[PDB]
Structure 1
Amino acid sequence: EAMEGPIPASILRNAVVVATGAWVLVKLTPVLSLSPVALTALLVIGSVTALGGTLIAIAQVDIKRALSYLVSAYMGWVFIAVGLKEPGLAFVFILTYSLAMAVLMMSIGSIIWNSVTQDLRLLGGLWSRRPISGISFLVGSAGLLAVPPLASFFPQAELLDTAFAQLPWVGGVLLLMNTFAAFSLGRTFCLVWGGEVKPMTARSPEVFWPMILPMTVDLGLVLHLPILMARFDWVIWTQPSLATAAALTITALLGWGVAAWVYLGKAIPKPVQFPLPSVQNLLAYDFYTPKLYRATVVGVVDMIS
């Protein structure tokens, strides 16, 4: 519900959510290390919110709410990392994730500003007539999951090696979190920039100079991050072990590819229905979290009041 008011959303989901609680949680690593129960609870919360955020972001129709659940998921990733007594990985990943999500939110805001709807079901062919806002989204996508060239790969590589050295099942989430989160962005690109053009976006002029300057200037930072960690030897993942470096990329590319096939394939009805209809409208309403709140806490605190 904090997706009311665009571009604090480009800064809140990107500069507040990333370094407000995660910053407090990381600098508390010495204290949280004292009890090996807070750490396992930390792993549980992070993994649960990661899986839930990815699965819910896949089942959204509002472009502005199909990225905030991904914010929840990639902050759960930081919860996981800090759960493995790895504060350095969290401090490194915050930077890359923040850059990428800034590009993503600015591109989505640019699309919204001129294409009034936010319904994914009402936006269509924009690639041919709107390149920058599309390539920026694509680069912000690649700089979040995979493409070892782009910089978010490095910090999510050590957290595979570390989660495999100890407590392997956690890695099984981190790997899986890399395909669902890739299927969401995929269906958010293949719905806003690919496909047949629709009434609401029949005449989409590209935006003016002040909305695509930061977006393109922030699209450069993401492309230089990988090379900015080469000039100055800031090695993040010491042992290469390409056996695991070839896993994240395969997972992400597979997710994004299935996403592109389902939506750019015209081999399926476009308002896609799930074989189980009851779970589609359950991920779409975030597990009915409001009906949960108004039942457990509010309903109590109100009643006794």
Structure 2
Amino acid sequence: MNMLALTIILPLIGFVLLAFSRGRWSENVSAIVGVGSVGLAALVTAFIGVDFFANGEQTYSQPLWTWMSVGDFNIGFNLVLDGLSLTMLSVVTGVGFLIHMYASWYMRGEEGYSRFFAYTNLFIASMVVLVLADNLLLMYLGWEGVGLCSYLLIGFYYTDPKNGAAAMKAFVVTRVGDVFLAFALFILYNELGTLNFREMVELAPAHFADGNNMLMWATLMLLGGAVGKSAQLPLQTWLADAMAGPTPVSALIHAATMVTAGVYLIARTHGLFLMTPEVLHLVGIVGAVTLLLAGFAALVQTDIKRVLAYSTMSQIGYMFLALGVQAWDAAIFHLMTHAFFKALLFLASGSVILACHHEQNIFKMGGLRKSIPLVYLCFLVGGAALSALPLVTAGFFSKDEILAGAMANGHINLMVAGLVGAFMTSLYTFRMIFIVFHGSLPLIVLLILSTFVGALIVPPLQGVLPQTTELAHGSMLTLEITSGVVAVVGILLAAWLWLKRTLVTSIANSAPGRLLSTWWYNAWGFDWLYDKVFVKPFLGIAWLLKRDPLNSMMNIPAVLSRFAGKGLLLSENGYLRWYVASMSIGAVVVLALLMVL
């Protein structure tokens, strides 16, 4: 059960071996090394979970060494595992193994096969370190690792400059989030003297009995890091533009590892967030606003992958809303189910991209059910889990617990935002589905897991996360009824507009309608705003400074010396009479100076 270090080391070994292989090995050997390392991590995770459940679900600690020891600054290299760490580790390892298998089938004949698998293995290793760390600095190591691996994998096809631009954009935005997280770490060490999660939770109420300002600052910066990595407000543009990379990269980023890191960080630091309730309600507000903007953008998108990206942003906003309403179990359960159906949706989208053999627009497609029915079924079940089809799919149950947690705590604005977001999700999901489709062992595995079979899995968060307040059974019944009615109404209504298109073209041609559609197509103008206030002044200051003005201003005395020497050399004209005259002038000056003192 002491093989948590094994779950770190095995993807690290895979990354190191495949990186030093440098493409010389065969495709089968590279696939064996990468997928086998990730699958071995998954199997060790399975055995760890079995023994964890065998011992009554007790938190286990595995220290390795002391990372830093400078006086009172003691940072340890220690892993910890509880129910939340087990759930995140199981999700990361299993979904990453399925994505690794599909990528092994999908990347055949591509350049950089072993480089791709080395980068994904380092991605898995970094996220395992992120979820297994017992202190914030080791979690920051994992955080920076997943940021670097996402940069390396988004710009995988490095010859296309758009891919590199998207990767650089994602890395810079995530690094801004990581700087916010670093601020949180500095605050928490300066106040509590430690960065261990359990020790910080234990020492926070005693230290912050008088003033709670620095803890609120630390939790606000923790949320800043979380929205940096989970692609929320106000750092959400990178997920929109990260479609330049390949499809298993998108599946790993959206389902397995990258976007779940902020949700895990908020869930793991839940004691500090509960000590600052205003910041926790701000987490809920951020999630609600982000899912609203993501749904409204997802309806007006033009490509399949952009719709999937904004759907990922919407469900991460749902998880942030669930964390803000203290529905921690609902948030983690929705994390697992969303990992399942979003990985399935990305796999089916990659299959239909390979079938179309081009980056074709969705408006040309139609009547593909008679050619590729299995991909249609996978897309349909992934959308039904996405759009919360009642009593058939796990996403309906996860969103039901999220809405029950929102109702039971006494937040009305977040409740109605979640309801209209479920409506919006149904509209954009079946818009995409009926626009494209009208007019494989991993695929079976996450097709099964995108049904109630995936809802049967209960996350063991009893000892680690606090239980959600119980809604009344009658209120739960009406909430389930109205959630099913909202989802069915959205499905039927979107099927009504997007089955010829007559009413959609009315708003799709009117000037306020064109203005709203183009405003929601440009990520609500956040890309333009960030280009205007951050990127363009950076380029302007760089162009202004490119000639090194401080070097010239320090070179000014050399210019003065050259000018003074050239001026002084004019008195050396070579005339003897002027030399005698200068001697007499100097005699006059010396005599006058001696007389005036």
Equivalent residues of 1:18, 1:98 under 8 A apart: no
CA shift, 1:193, in A, is 0.6
Structure 2 SS opposite 1:222: coil
- The one of 241, 248, 253 equivalent to 1:12 is 253
CA shift, 1:282, in A, is 1.1
Residue 451 (structure 2) pairs with residue 223 (structure 1) = yes
Query: How many aligned residue pairs are there?
Result: 287
Distance in 2 between residues matched to 1:187 and 1:61, nearest whole Å: 11
Distance in 1 between residues matched to 2:398 and 2:370, nearest whole Å: 34
Structure 2 SS opposite 1:189: helix
Distance in 1 between residues matched to 2:415 and 2:262, nearest whole Å: 23
CA 1:302–1:13: 2 relative to 1, 3 Å: same
- The one of 415, 421, 446 equivalent to 1:177 is 421
Q: Which residue of 1 aligns with 2:405?
A: 162
Distance in 2 between residues matched to 1:239 and 1:141, nearest whole Å: 30
Answer with 113-122 or 49-58: which moved more. 113-122
CA shift, 1:299, in A, is 3.1
CA 1:301–1:56: 2 relative to 1, 3 Å: same
- The one of 523, 528, 532 equivalent to 1:286 is 523
Q: Which residue of 2 aligns with 1:202?
A: none
Q: Which residue of 1 aligns with 2:381?
A: 139
Equivalent residues of 1:18, 1:94 under 8 A apart: no
- The one of 221, 244, 255 equivalent to 2:490 is 255
Distance in 2 between residues matched to 1:253 and 1:283, nearest whole Å: 25
CA 1:216–1:238: 2 relative to 1, 3 Å: farther
Which residue type is aligned with residue 390 of structure 2? V
* Superimposed CA distance per residue, residues 130-172 of structure 1 (whole angstroms, 9 cap, x where no aligned partner): 1110111111111232322321222322322232231111100
Residue 538 (structure 2) pairs with residue 298 (structure 1) = no
Which residues of structure 2 form unaligned runs of 5+?
Answer: 1-240, 543-597
Answer with 59-68 or 153-162: which moved more. 153-162
TM-score by length of 2: 0.45
Structure 2 SS opposite 1:60: coil
CA shift, 1:248, in A, is 1.2
Equivalent residues of 1:64, 1:118 under 8 A apart: no
RMSD between aligned residues: 2.5
Q: Which residue of 2 aligns with 1:3?
A: 243
Structure 2 SS opposite 1:21: helix
CA shift, 1:271, in A, is 9.7
* Superimposed CA distance per residue, residues 183-241 of structure 1 (whole angstroms, 9 cap, x where no aligned partner): 1110111111111xxxxxxxxxxxxxxxx4322232122235257349x9x99987553
Q: Which residue of 2 aligns with 1:203?
A: none
Which residue type is aligned with residue 156 of structure 1? K
CA 1:148–1:21: 2 relative to 1, 3 Å: same
Equivalent residues of 2:367, 2:437 under 8 A apart: yes
Matches within 5 A, 1:226-245: 226=454, 228-229=456-457, 240=473, 241-245=476-480
Q: Which residue of 1 aligns with 2:368?
A: 126
* Superimposed CA distance per residue, residues 25-53 of structure 1 (whole angstroms, 9 cap, x where no aligned partner): 21111111111221122122111110000
Structure 1 SS opposite 2:367: coil
Q: Which residue of 2 aligns with 1:201?
A: none
Distance in 1 between residues matched to 2:504 and 2:290, nearest whole Å: 30
The structure, 1 or 2, with the larger RCO (C-alpha pairs under 8 Å, 6+ apart) is: 1
Which residue type is aligned with residue 393 of structure 2? L
Q: Which residue of 2 aligns with 1:65?
A: 306
Structure 1 SS opposite 2:453: helix
CA 1:227–1:57: 2 relative to 1, 3 Å: closer
CA 1:172–1:113: 2 relative to 1, 3 Å: same
CA shift, 1:287, in A, is 1.7
Q: Which residue of 1 aligns with 2:434?
A: 190
Q: Which residue of 2 aligns with 1:105?
A: 346
CA 1:85–1:259: 2 relative to 1, 3 Å: same
Structure 2 SS opposite 1:61: coil
Identity %: 24
- The one of 329, 335, 356 equivalent to 1:88 is 329
Answer with 119-128 or 16-25: which moved more. 16-25
Structure 2 SS opposite 1:81: helix
CA shift, 1:18, in A, is 4.0
Residue 356 (structure 2) pairs with residue 117 (structure 1) = no
Equivalent residues of 1:55, 1:283 under 8 A apart: yes
Which residue type is aligned with residue 297 of structure 1? F
Distance in 2 between residues matched to 1:227 and 1:187, nearest whole Å: 25
Distance in 2 between residues matched to 1:183 and 1:258, nearest whole Å: 7
TM-score by length of 1: 0.86
Equivalent residues of 2:366, 2:438 under 8 A apart: yes
Answer with 139-148 or 268-277: which moved more. 268-277
Distance in 2 between residues matched to 1:181 and 1:148, nearest whole Å: 17
Equivalent residues of 1:263, 1:270 under 8 A apart: no
- The one of 251, 261, 264 equivalent to 2:499 is 264
Which residue type is aligned with residue 294 of structure 1? D
Which residue type is aligned with residue 254 of structure 1? V
Equivalent residues of 1:117, 1:123 under 8 A apart: no
Structure 1 SS opposite 2:314: helix
Structure 1 SS opposite 2:247: coil
CA shift, 1:114, in A, is 1.6
